[PDB]
Amino acid sequence: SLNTIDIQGDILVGMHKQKQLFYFFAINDPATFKTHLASDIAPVVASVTQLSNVATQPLVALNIAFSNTGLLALGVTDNLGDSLFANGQAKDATSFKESTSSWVPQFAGTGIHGVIILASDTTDLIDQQVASIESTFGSSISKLSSLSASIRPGNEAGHEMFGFLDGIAQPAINGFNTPLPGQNIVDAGVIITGATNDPITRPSWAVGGSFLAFRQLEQLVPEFNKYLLDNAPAGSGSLQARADLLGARMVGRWKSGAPIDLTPTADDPALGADAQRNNNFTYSHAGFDLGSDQSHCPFSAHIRKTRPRADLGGSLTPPNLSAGANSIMRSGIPYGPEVTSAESASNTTTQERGLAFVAYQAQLSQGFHFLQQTSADNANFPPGKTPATVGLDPIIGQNNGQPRVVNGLLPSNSSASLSIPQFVVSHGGEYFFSPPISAIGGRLSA
Ligand code: HEM
């Protein structure tokens, strides 16, 4: 059964701190690094168990993950059973129709050996912990780059940079989570390596870990806002209200979190806020043909692309349980400054902001990589639709820098196509393995 005492907390619970830092490092002098990995890091790595109880939530929550080259730097030559991980994300970039030539140079290679995730309610507390780490490891650890992140302020807390409530939908792990209405229920082995029904044999020390897919995804917020206003469908309501409808059609939820499948023409903030109701849908509606009806939610909507529910078969009434093996746990958090007055006024981005995207899964080919390549970037996914050309995911869909053709967004005519510029720009990332806690002071320090 699932030993959550040994699983790093960000995988199944999330850090849920106001501030987060992703500290990307290289390893020098591995013998020294190992001594301090065991003495300074292992004892303060936060587990799922620790983070699940308010009384044992640490002032500073810390998780750590290693790239393939990081594991090799530690002398670990075992096959973790994931080719995508082994090759690194840079080599996978072409799978998503982007080029590493546009990436942050540090990501465009395999020099990064790991990431330390620090999380606390102030940046000062994070900085203290970083200083402590640098002090004790000394030059055996080398900071290559970092990314600071934060829960957004005020009423936007929990929302991402475009303004949409985030973190609503996660797979429920059978035997661990108490499933919510509409929530998918999956074997632990979909997310945790070596757990129930993970078909891939793993090294013994790796049982209880997960692969971490990190993506630095810049969001062009003023451009997005202006696009919605310019293309707002006609109707009663303010221009902004109509623009909001278009945005909700693109995401699959209103900014409040209310799923459009359950409220297609108007927002419902109370619904959005209620975990017992805001996920209780399958995309099926009696009296409507699933293959052609986009009046409730477009086939191209972001959440419909990333969790198709009834589009891939299964129960038409909640909960739909299709494609469990293609589930990911998300622990993303926004980064960069809020949109400034001048940027909003000019409808133009000057400073970089976006999502520090984090997905956990036991198989990269089934999770993040599949959702990006086979769904989001695929004009003919989901399958079996009429028209067959769904178009691309308007939020994350990519086609080598070109505007994306996205169909079904306009309620007045499902055959109407929009050509949408990219609102999300990849600056690259890396694939890591978050080991079980026992491996940190154990195998990895040996
Ligand atoms: C800046 C980029 C992104 C933004 C702004 C964004 C935004 C959102 C929002 C607002 C939601 C709805 C809230 C929720 O259901 O929890 C969502 C859901 C989701 N997103 Fe994204 N996301 C981004 C990147 C990605 C990427 C790259 C992937 C995978 C390749 C992804 C996969 C998912 C999944 C699996 C869900 C939940 C779907 C469900 O269970 O119904 N997201 N995202």
Numbering used by the authors: 3 to 448
Paste lines from the article:
DyPs (dye-decolorizing peroxidases) (EC 1.11.1.19) represent a new family of haem peroxidases widespread in bacteria, archaea, fungi and other micro-organisms. In the present study, we expressed A. auricula-judae DyP in E. coli, solved the crystal structure of the recombinant enzyme and several site-directed variants, and used PELE (Protein Energy Landscape Exploration) to describe the binding of its typical substrate RB19. The DyP structure is formed by two domains, each of them including an antiparallel four-stranded large β-sheet and two or three helices resulting in a ferredoxin-like fold (plus two additional β-strands). In spite of the obvious similarity between the two domains, only the C-terminal domain harbours a haem cofactor.
Moreover, most of the variants show crystal structures largely superimposable with that of WT DyP, except for the mutated residues. Aromatic residues were changed to serine in the simple W377S, Y147S and Y337S variants (the latter with low refolding yield). The proof for Trp-377 being involved in the mixed protein radical was provided by the W377S variant. In the high-resolution narrow scan of its 9 GHz EPR spectrum (top), the tryptophanyl contribution observed for WT DyP completely disappeared (the spectrum of the W377S/Y147S variant, not shown, being nearly superimposable). As a main conclusion, Trp-377 appears responsible for the high-turnover catalytic site, since its substitution (W377S variant) completely prevented high-turnover oxidation of RB19 and DMP (and decreased over 40-fold the catalytic efficiency of high-turnover ABTS oxidation). In contrast, similar Tyr-337 and Tyr-147 variants (and the double Y147F/Y337F variant) only slightly affected substrate oxidation, and did not remove the high-turnover site.
